Amino acid sequence: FGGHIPQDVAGKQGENVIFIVYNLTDSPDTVDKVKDVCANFSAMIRSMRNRFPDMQFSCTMGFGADAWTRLFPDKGKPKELSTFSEIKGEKYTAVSTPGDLLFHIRAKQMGLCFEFASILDEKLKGAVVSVDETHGFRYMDGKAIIGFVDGTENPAVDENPYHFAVIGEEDADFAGGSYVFVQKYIHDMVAWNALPVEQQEKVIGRHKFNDVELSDEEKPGNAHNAVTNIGDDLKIVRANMPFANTSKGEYGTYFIGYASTFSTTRRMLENMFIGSPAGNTDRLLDFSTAITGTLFFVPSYDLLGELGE
Amino acid sequence: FGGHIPQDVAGKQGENVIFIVYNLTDSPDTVDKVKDVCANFSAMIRSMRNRFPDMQFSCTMGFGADAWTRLFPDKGKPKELSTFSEIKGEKYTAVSTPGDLLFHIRAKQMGLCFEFASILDEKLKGAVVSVDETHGFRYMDGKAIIGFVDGTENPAVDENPYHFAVIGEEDADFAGGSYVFVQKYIHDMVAWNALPVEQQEKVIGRHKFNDVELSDEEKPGNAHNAVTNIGDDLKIVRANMPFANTSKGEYGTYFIGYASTFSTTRRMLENMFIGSPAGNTDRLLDFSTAITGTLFFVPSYDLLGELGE
Amino acid sequence: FGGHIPQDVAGKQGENVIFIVYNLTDSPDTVDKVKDVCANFSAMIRSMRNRFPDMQFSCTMGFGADAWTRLFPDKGKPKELSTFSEIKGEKYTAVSTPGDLLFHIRAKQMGLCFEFASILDEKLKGAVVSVDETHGFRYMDGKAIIGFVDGTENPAVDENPYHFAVIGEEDADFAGGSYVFVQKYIHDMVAWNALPVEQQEKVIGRHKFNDVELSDEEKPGNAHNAVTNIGDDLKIVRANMPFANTSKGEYGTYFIGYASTFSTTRRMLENMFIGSPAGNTDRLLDFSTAITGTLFFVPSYDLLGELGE
Amino acid sequence: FGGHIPQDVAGKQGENVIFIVYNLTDSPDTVDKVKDVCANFSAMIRSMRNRFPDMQFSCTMGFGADAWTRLFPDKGKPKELSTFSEIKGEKYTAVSTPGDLLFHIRAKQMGLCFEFASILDEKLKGAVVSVDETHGFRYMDGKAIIGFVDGTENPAVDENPYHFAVIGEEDADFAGGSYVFVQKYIHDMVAWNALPVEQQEKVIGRHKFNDVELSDEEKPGNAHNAVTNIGDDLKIVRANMPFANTSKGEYGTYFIGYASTFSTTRRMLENMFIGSPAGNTDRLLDFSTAITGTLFFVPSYDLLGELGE
Amino acid sequence: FGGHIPQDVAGKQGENVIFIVYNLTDSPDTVDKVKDVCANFSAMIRSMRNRFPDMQFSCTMGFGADAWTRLFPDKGKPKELSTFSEIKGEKYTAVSTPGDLLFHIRAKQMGLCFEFASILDEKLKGAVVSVDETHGFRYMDGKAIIGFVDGTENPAVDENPYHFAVIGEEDADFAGGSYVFVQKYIHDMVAWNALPVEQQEKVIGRHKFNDVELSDEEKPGNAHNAVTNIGDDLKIVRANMPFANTSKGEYGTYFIGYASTFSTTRRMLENMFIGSPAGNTDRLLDFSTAITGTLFFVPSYDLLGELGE
Amino acid sequence: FGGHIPQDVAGKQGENVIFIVYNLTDSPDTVDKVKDVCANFSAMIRSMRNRFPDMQFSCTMGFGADAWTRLFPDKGKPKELSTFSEIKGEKYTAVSTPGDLLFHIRAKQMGLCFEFASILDEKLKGAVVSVDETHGFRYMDGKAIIGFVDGTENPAVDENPYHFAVIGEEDADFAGGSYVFVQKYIHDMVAWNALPVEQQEKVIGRHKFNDVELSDEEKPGNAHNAVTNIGDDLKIVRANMPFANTSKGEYGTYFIGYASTFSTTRRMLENMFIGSPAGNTDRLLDFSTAITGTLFFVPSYDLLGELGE
Ligand SMILES: [Cl-]
Ligand SMILES: [Cl-]
Ligand SMILES: [Cl-]
Ligand SMILES: [Cl-]
Ligand SMILES: [Cl-]
Ligand SMILES: [Cl-]
Ligand SMILES: [Cl-]
Ligand SMILES: [Cl-]
Ligand SMILES: [Cl-]
Ligand SMILES: [Cl-]
Ligand SMILES: [Cl-]
Ligand SMILES: [Cl-]
Ligand SMILES: [Cl-]
Ligand SMILES: [Cl-]
Ligand SMILES: [Cl-]
Ligand SMILES: [Cl-]
Ligand SMILES: [Cl-]
Ligand SMILES: [Cl-]
Ligand code: NA
Ligand code: NA
Ligand code: NA
Ligand code: NA
Ligand code: NA
Ligand code: NA
């Protein structure tokens, strides 16, 4: 990665997570306050890890396409950093919604995520407004909120997740960076829970209990893991973090996918929402509605430091 | 307690917490669905503790005053179970707000709280509407969100917390039960953080770093721990659980206090909001606004089972 | 329990377990060697717990009916300590098989169970021959090897498991003791795994994923949890510990049930193997074959010490 | 114990330990400062346990015989609280050395012991002078510094350690209290390490590897565990905590023994230093030299509170 | 390693272990079923590590010499992959016994090893028969079952264990692979335990308590660690995992050694069984009998994937 | 580092620590005994890590300037290995005090540090005399004993600590080595504790509660973190480990700093004790007195092995 250290874009999914999306304000301190956070970001992480070395603390910081150009007009721009274009299928739509800054905060204890987030609040006071804050949690043995283990397909063991999450020499000025895409999905849990397990397995493409992938013969072409694994060893590093307000019957998945090239993520989204071939849409979308969709660029630590100067 | 096993009303504060307050609906299944939960409540707890014996899982279930009489007209009524009467001081008000059912869910992992809460959602579908759901977290070494350790005054070590949290033979028909009072407080963190530590210590009545109580000579009469410790060995078992949406600058404390007699809690509230003497109000209320206030009765497990029959 | 301390008969199920059943030999040292173990049993447990206070070490020791009378002719005999009589149904049989001594060894690490067992081997050299040794393990979140959580029905939370596991003043000379019954079951995993989950749930009587008991309307009368919960608040404390040699396709459950009265266990077995009414047998027996069955008496520590004198 | 809650006198041995012995000064604040600590002692423990609920924090506080009478002339005196009288054998002497206050501080982390001790330092400033401070540590699986597991003989499993550590109705005014005796031993490690293991086992009376007690036939009458187990079910609760400055070749054991009656401890000491019969001294004293010896009274929490009034 | 990722051949020894050796059957599905496992092996590991990231799950898969040629006739063959030739000394024999597939499964919980093994059973049904299954456990602080710490000599700290366990460019077509040799040893524990510790130390070549290597002057030339450390910085990565059925008096060590070149392992075996010089055999073989001996090739993950195509 | 593996000079700070400084004696075994430790050092570490893989055991070994030349006259000498020259300011002095060997021992349990240290004592018997032994502990969330988090400035996250701690090709014969400097500081805790928090923050240069660095506008030029961060990306890897004997009112910090070049450490010391500009001394020195100061060279493991030949 040209000797550039990436942010934690190939990290495992935390036990506790905070996703914050901010929009910038037009205040006369906005650029400076954002740059203060850029300058001090790795120090804030150092502080947490020094204080709580066993709590697996991590935070990543990303920038929206318009925000990047506003904040950093002379820094160039990653080749694929452009506002996400809505993908509208015959039935489902991957919406494109606002967001200038993304913070993805993970730790073994929620109190540490809060601590970091509170300092961001203080440092960015007047410079930002909240677009979304979602709190997530690890559910059992890495299950998505629909009760199936998620993440087994992430590159690991015989592949290096950094290879798939981090920009390389194909865009050398931004090597060590990453393209991260987020979507909030709201589930129809009543309809999902009405499906027998065997039908749920056909929707997902893996066995519910033991997480073993369905055989080609058993796996339908519109299974979630069939359509989202686009092939040709093109992969991203994904979470699907549960969030919920059960008292209101609200159950969701916060999708976050880090990629060396956004083209992979976008192809996955095309396969899901349009279908390959057209109409062969992700069956899981019959139970899941995308209500946000935003692309951010996550710079290498080296670049982040330069941004803060 | 007349041989009655209490719910977990003298438990320590969890690492992760969900507070849910429901109102009952007028559906023709409402009483039956609530009774199903009553009947199966200890089984649901058994399941969690059997599956995750090291995760310190706990849930308590309580009933509002009006709800109790609606649901269980022939079961009698605890002597102090009456709708909380708002306490209006010259400056501050402890508001009285709605709530028919309370669930207080605690565990070492938020995913387990979610699991339990999702089953409550399913079992109570159509019988309830959400009044409030708040998610809390343990912050560092048991700090309240204002950065001071909280809970050291809870009866422990040389006193038995059950003695102070659980109804005894003074109301024998409900021995083993508890009166629980909840309040959501929203903090003015900007004003709080502007105070030097030494002034913050005078507001709280303990040292910030080492949690040592201020000496009588140093402790003001309007310190939080001066006014809320009402004396005569009358005590309750309290949490003040942090909650926050930092992206919106929202910082709060979810107060929950379990008592053998609500008269103690009410006297504490009088001391805080009216002052003893009048005007000697809790200085912490200059930085904290109560936005909910509700009393619930938490029956013994024995009684809970009878309620579900 | 007449002031008698029971052995660990209401303990939770260990992470690692060793079940050993010995027969006595006719050697001229047999009684003395057994008495040496009786005399030193609580010391051996003290040693383990002193050395490894966080490893949840436990061992229980029990005696077969014939063995008890051979070893201890003048100590009287528990009222229900008689060789188990085989229960033969129209289709299934709960066999009665040999065993003079039972050791049930549990800990957070298998190495500690081994340590204790090796010392028993040394102390009993020449006095015993192995009838069976089975090693078990906790499987996920307390699942039985058939993939369903087991043990949720064990008395806990609003009931005291000692009340159900320990002999009381109804047999005062043996108060603090327990009746323990063991059975090895071999499963037909191929047939079991061929069942859809919804049919598996009807066999067990609980939901597979969330361990919620089936409703009366949904639960068949021959479900495992219907037939084994005999009613009238008559209960025992059970494990169903997984064991396996997967390379040979061997999958089993080692049943062990501690009871204040063996009559409860025997009634449960009648319900399973004969049926109540006759023919209403445990559906789980269509997938599980009992290959051992033995009753042992587990004395209080006080009595155990006397036995060793 | 007359309804009196004892201090942690039957606690297990901590991972990290601080033993502090203070003498009182003649300052005109000495009694008041000591009483401040008495009054606030259980609060200081509450604070630690509230902040660090999983760190097994404990502290006990005891008073020397002369100090008790100086500080509390009108509180009466425990029947056996008298300055320890040196026990001089033909070869070895159990010395009697000064000490007015004892603090025995234990936790899973040394930093917590330090925290508590620093607050004691602050509260007692000018009122005390240090007689001894020793820091100890748990060594492997509860080994004493001579490489043998220690503490297995402590009452546990089939006996209640409080019964042996806590004063009962035989001295009702002080029920809930305890007699604690401390000795620092310095070892001749070079001589000890020169002994073959089999001879070391004869000195101790247990096997080195597996902690199994030697048989009567194998155990010499002067073995440490033979002479210190005085019989007739008279027992105390002991630690022998390792301490060392290896750079100076200094290896020691800090003995601390809590007893319901000091007469048991004193009889043990007679057996060790004089011998029963005379000359049958503890063989371990051939490798261990007592350099301190002091008796303290550890009051119940109830009494401690009264002392602080 | 030519850019090839090795299997976990330099892993530490698990807390719980399963060793399975299978023979292939002559069924018309055998090759395909084995290839299915090859193709899905890294996915099965990904699943376990995704679900249980803190449980240190690992599995390695190896092939016997004859099996390799049967299954993969056109893949070439590692230079040293040939059926192990029995080493017969004047007194002891390192036997050569059957085995086509080896699975070495390790984790912090035995239930996870079982899970993985059960899926192998299902996937290989009809294609294999069990030759041996042995379950092992970590014993105390990494002790072998003879009570001495084992594994300290494994390359680590100032050497890289992969260098010694993994084939390099000397056999480039198989770089990233490993030669693994397994032997089951049965111990004469009665004879071993009859040896004084000082003689046991001379058999092993290290001190029993502190694991310090004997000095050259003290260490006999036939000590286990003298004869098995062949010199010239030629090393392998070894376990000696305890296994036992104590009820039958059966105590064993399951030897498993991973090597970049089998020539090192074979030289070690020559030193042990024949002696260097002849007759200078491993003294530990006077207490240990080899009852199996088989060589397997453990391919890199890259190659394993190709094998499964 | 020329392919040389460094000792643990960029390790995190242990939970428990032992610092030992020895002087050599003039005995006729001194060189040989030191060389025995050199030869066996990595083996001793291997043993600890093999036995206790989860206890984060570490030890580093360093040599004083005079000692190096005495022991190893023909090995050359690191370019900056010269006896530390006392730095005397107008008010404060960084003293230079004796020491020939340094051992820095860290682990999650103090018993493991003791174990290692005891073996060093045995191996070095007669060859050394103790200059200092200090025991340290981690205090809360990595706080120095003055109650502020320390170590956040250590290179990490976006920098590699080895780059700053380890000698590179600028001194190729010693690449992989490190310069370590130790100082014992004694604090005036009474004066420190009398400072309001806001003044303490000005002395340190960070906020006490949240460890956030003071802004340039708020941070005085004589703040500890201003003067010790010398700039130009010149950094060392530091601990400031707490030690104390609270009973004597003794509170200290054991400074230890590992550096690729001692010139950085020395410049830091100049800034602290003399001031840059002169007189702009570290304000923390108004509360901290240096009582030792010694430089040691910590060789790579490769070189250490050669030294032991
Ligand atoms: Cl931590
Ligand atoms: Cl710019
Ligand atoms: Cl797009
Ligand atoms: Cl758990
Ligand atoms: Cl009613
Ligand atoms: Cl009211
Ligand atoms: Cl332990
Ligand atoms: Cl008898
Ligand atoms: Cl029967
Ligand atoms: Cl804790
Ligand atoms: Cl008095
Ligand atoms: Cl005396
Ligand atoms: Cl895990
Ligand atoms: Cl082929
Ligand atoms: Cl060969
Ligand atoms: Cl460990
Ligand atoms: Cl030299
Ligand atoms: Cl210098
Ligand atoms: Na501005
Ligand atoms: Na209805
Ligand atoms: Na005999
Ligand atoms: Na005074
Ligand atoms: Na076929
Ligand atoms: Na010499």
DSSP assignment string, chain C: -TTPPP-SSSPPPPSEEEEEEEEEP--TTHHHHHHHHHHHHHHHHHHHHHH-TTS--EEEEEE-HHHHHHH-TTS---TT-SPPPPEE-SS-EE-----SEEEEEEESSHHHHHHHHHHHHHHTTTTEEEEEEEEEE-BTTTB-TTSSB--TTSS-SSS-HHHHHS--GGGGGGTT-EEEEEEEEEE-HHHHHTS-HHHHHHHHSB-TTT-PBPPTTTS-TTSHHHHH--STT---EEEEEEEEEGGGTEEEEEEEEEES-HHHHHHHHHHHHTTTTTT---GGGGSEEE---EEEEE--HHHHHHHT-
Tell if the CB–CB gap between A12 and E53 is shorter than 8 Å: yes
Query: CB neighbours of D116 closer than 8 A, spacing ≥ 6?
Result: D44, D48, D57, D59, D105
Q: Which of F141, F196, F209 sits opposite B196 (nearest CB)?
A: F196
Alpha carbon of D56 to ligand 2 centroid (Å): 54
Could you tell me if B82 and B68 are in contact, meaning their C-beta atoms sit under 8 angstroms apart?
no
B89-122 in b/e burial notation, b at 16+ Cβ within 10 A? Answer: beebebbbbebbbbbbbbbbbbbbbbbbbbbbbe
Backbone dihedral angles phi then psi of residue D252, each to the nearest 5 degrees: -145, 165
β-bridge pairing F178-187 and E87-88: unpaired
Among the listed residues E167, E97, E142, E162, the one whose alpha carbon sits nearest the alpha carbon of residue E239: E142
Q: Give the domain extent around B68.
A: 1-309
How many alpha carbons fall within 13 Å on the CB side of residue D205?
A: 19
CA–CA separation, B95 and B269 (whole Å)? 11
CA–CA separation, B175 and A289 (whole Å)? 49
Count of CB atoms situated within 10 Å of the CB of B250: 15
CA–CA separation, C126 and C114 (whole Å)? 19
CA–CA separation, A295 and D120 (whole Å)? 56
Q: Any idea how long chain B is?
A: 309
Identify the sign of the CA torsion B263, B266, B271, B274: negative
Question: Which amino acid makes up residue C278?
Answer: A
Among the listed residues A306, A302, A304, A295, the one whose alpha carbon sits nearest the alpha carbon of residue A79: A295
In terms of C-beta density within 10 A (0-12 exposed, 13-18 middle, 19 or more buried), how is residue C96 classed?
middle
How many alpha carbons fall within 13 Å on the CB side of residue B76?
A: 11
Chain C hits for B45, Cβ within 8 Å: 157
State which residue of chain C sits closest to A208, comparing Cα positions.
C209
State which residue of chain A sits closest to E122, comparing Cα positions.
A212
CA–CA separation, A149 and E109 (whole Å)? 19
Chain B hits for C56, Cβ within 8 Å: none
Query: CB neighbours of C284 closer than 8 A, spacing ≥ 6?
Result: C146, C203, C204, C224
Question: Which amino acid makes up residue F100?
Answer: D
Alpha carbon of B296 to ligand 20 centroid (Å): 25
A interface mutation test: which of B122, B247, B250 has the most A CBs within 10 A? B247
Helix axes F110-123, F30-51, angle to 10 degrees: 150
Among the listed residues A207, A212, A225, A231, the one whose alpha carbon sits nearest the alpha carbon of residue A283: A225
Query: CB neighbours of F74 closer than 8 A, spacing ≥ 6?
Result: none
Tell if the CB–CB gap between B141 and D305 is shorter than 8 Å: no
Q: Which of D15, D121, D244 sits opposite F246 (nearest CB)?
A: D121
Chain C hits for B304, Cβ within 8 Å: 158
**Rounded alpha-carbon distances, angstroms, from residue B76 to A51, B80, B171, D256:** 54, 12, 11, 56
E45-66 in b/e burial notation, b at 16+ Cβ within 10 A? Answer: bbbbbbbbbebbbbbbbbbbbb
Element (H, E) at F74: none
Tokens of F129: 């005399």
Chain D hits for E208, Cβ within 8 Å: 197, 209
Identify the sign of the CA torsion A195, A197, A203, A208: positive
What DSSP assignment string belongs to B62-93?
Answer: EE-HHHHHHH-TTS---TT-SPPPPEE-SS-E
Count of CB atoms situated within 10 Å of the CB of C249: 14
CA–CA separation, E254 and E19 (whole Å)? 9
CA–CA separation, C6 and E127 (whole Å)? 50
Q: Do chains E and B touch (3 or more CB pairs under 8 A)?
A: no
Could you tell me if E224 and E205 are in contact, meaning their C-beta atoms sit under 8 angstroms apart?
yes
Residue position matching structure tokens 């490798």: D287
Question: Which amino acid makes up residue F5?
Answer: I
The F-side interface with B (CB below 8 A) comprises 140-141, 147, 196-198, 208-209
Tokens of E272: 């042990």
Could you tell me if E8 and E103 are in contact, meaning their C-beta atoms sit under 8 angstroms apart?
no
How many alpha carbons fall within 13 Å on the CB side of residue C83?
A: 10
Alpha carbon of C59 to ligand 7 centroid (Å): 16
Distance from CA of residue D281 to its chain's centroid?
21
Q: After which residues is chain C broken (C to N over 2.5 A)?
A: none
CA–CA separation, A167 and A297 (whole Å)? 10
Could you tell me if F8 and F60 are in contact, meaning their C-beta atoms sit under 8 angstroms apart?
yes
Tokens of E67: 């099996």
Could you tell me if A192 and A287 are in contact, meaning their C-beta atoms sit under 8 angstroms apart?
yes
A interface mutation test: which of F152, F158, F206 has the most A CBs within 10 A? F158
E29 is annotated as an active-site residue: no
Could you tell me if F282 and F172 are in contact, meaning their C-beta atoms sit under 8 angstroms apart?
no
User: Beta partners for B243?
Assistant: B252
Element (H, E) at F26: none
Alpha carbon of D255 to ligand 5 centroid (Å): 62
Chain B hits for A16, Cβ within 8 Å: 16, 110, 137
Alpha carbon of F295 to ligand 17 centroid (Å): 20
β-bridge pairing C294-298 and C178-187: antiparallel
Among the listed residues E213, A298, E107, B237, the one whose alpha carbon sits nearest the alpha carbon of residue F41: E213
B interface mutation test: which of F139, F209, F211, F218 has the most B CBs within 10 A? F209
Tokens of A106: 């993970």
Tell if the CB–CB gap between A45 and F212 is shorter than 8 Å: no
Tokens of B162: 């059950």
Question: Which amino acid makes up residue F224?
Answer: H
Identify the sign of the CA torsion C192, C198, C202, C204: positive
In terms of C-beta density within 10 A (0-12 exposed, 13-18 middle, 19 or more buried), how is residue C268 classed?
buried
**Rounded alpha-carbon distances, angstroms, from residue A2 to A9, A11, A262, D84:** 17, 20, 20, 75
Helix axes E30-51, E110-123, angle to 10 degrees: 150
Q: How many domains does chain F have?
A: 1
CA–CA separation, A282 and A223 (whole Å)? 6
Among the listed residues B105, B146, B121, the one whose alpha carbon sits nearest the alpha carbon of residue B242: B146
User: Beta partners for C185?
Assistant: C253, C290
User: From the CA of A49, which ligand is nearest?
Assistant: 1
CA–CA separation, F296 and B109 (whole Å)? 47
CA–CA separation, E106 and E117 (whole Å)? 11
Distance from CA of residue F81 to its chain's centroid?
15
Alpha carbon of C91 to ligand 15 centroid (Å): 55
Could you tell me if C148 and C208 are in contact, meaning their C-beta atoms sit under 8 angstroms apart?
yes
Q: Do chains D and B touch (3 or more CB pairs under 8 A)?
A: yes
Could you tell me if D168 and D175 are in contact, meaning their C-beta atoms sit under 8 angstroms apart?
yes
The E-side interface with F (CB below 8 A) comprises 12, 141-142, 149, 151-154, 156-158, 210-213
**How many secondary structure helices (H) and strands (E) does chain B include?**
9, 11
How far from each other are the two terminal CA atoms of chain C, in whole angstroms?
22
Chain F hits for E211, Cβ within 8 Å: 47, 50-51
The E-side interface with C (CB below 8 A) comprises 15-16, 20, 22, 109-111, 114-115, 117-118, 120-122, 125, 128, 130, 132-133, 135, 137-140, 193, 242, 244-249, 251
In terms of C-beta density within 10 A (0-12 exposed, 13-18 middle, 19 or more buried), how is residue A90 classed?
exposed
Query: CB neighbours of F156 closer than 8 A, spacing ≥ 6?
Result: A46, A49, A50
Tell if the CB–CB gap between B43 and C151 is shorter than 8 Å: no
Q: Do chains E and F touch (3 or more CB pairs under 8 A)?
A: yes
Tell if the CB–CB gap between E158 and F5 is shorter than 8 Å: yes
Resolution (A): 1.6
What DSSP assignment string belongs to C113-137?
Answer: HHHHHHHHHHHTTTTEEEEEEEEEE
Strand stretches in F188-245, DSSP E: 237-245
Please state whether A87 falls in left (phi above 0), alpha (psi between -120 and 50) or beta. beta
Strand stretches in chain D, DSSP E: 16-24, 58-63, 87-88, 93-94, 101-107, 128-137, 178-187, 237-245, 250-259, 288-290, 294-298
Count of CB atoms situated within 10 Å of the CB of E88: 12
State which residue of chain B sits closest to C148, comparing Cα positions.
B51
Tell if the CB–CB gap between A138 and B247 is shorter than 8 Å: no
Q: Which of C47, C53, C301 sits opposite D211 (nearest CB)?
A: C47
3-state secondary structure at position D63? strand
CA–CA separation, D217 and E301 (whole Å)? 60
In terms of C-beta density within 10 A (0-12 exposed, 13-18 middle, 19 or more buried), how is residue E15 classed?
buried
Element (H, E) at B104: strand B101-107
How many alpha carbons fall within 13 Å on the CB side of residue D105?
A: 27
Chain C hits for E120, Cβ within 8 Å: 246
User: Beta partners for E101?
Assistant: E22, E63
The secondary structure of residue F133, as a DSSP letter, is E
CA–CA separation, E307 and E37 (whole Å)? 10
